[PDB]
Amino acid sequence: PVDESRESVAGPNIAAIVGGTVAGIVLIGILLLVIWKALIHLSDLREYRRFE
Numbered sequence: 001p002v003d004e005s006r007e008s009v010a011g012p013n014i015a016a017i018v019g020g021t022v023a024g025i026v027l028i029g030i031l032l033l034v035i036w037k038a039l040i041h042l043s044d045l046r047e048y049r050r051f052e
Contacts, residue, residue: 045051
């Protein structure tokens with residue numbers, strides 16, 4: 001473990017919510033995208049009996 005963890009609180013202007021909203025939506029989209037694509041992609045080969 002060679003990482004650190006600092007605080008992240010303040011509450012800036014309206015930008016606070018604006019950025020948080022876009023970040024959350026985009027995060028959920030890209031996350032679900034890679035997870036869904038990878039899940040169906042990895043599962044595709046899993047279907048067949050060539051798991052070996």
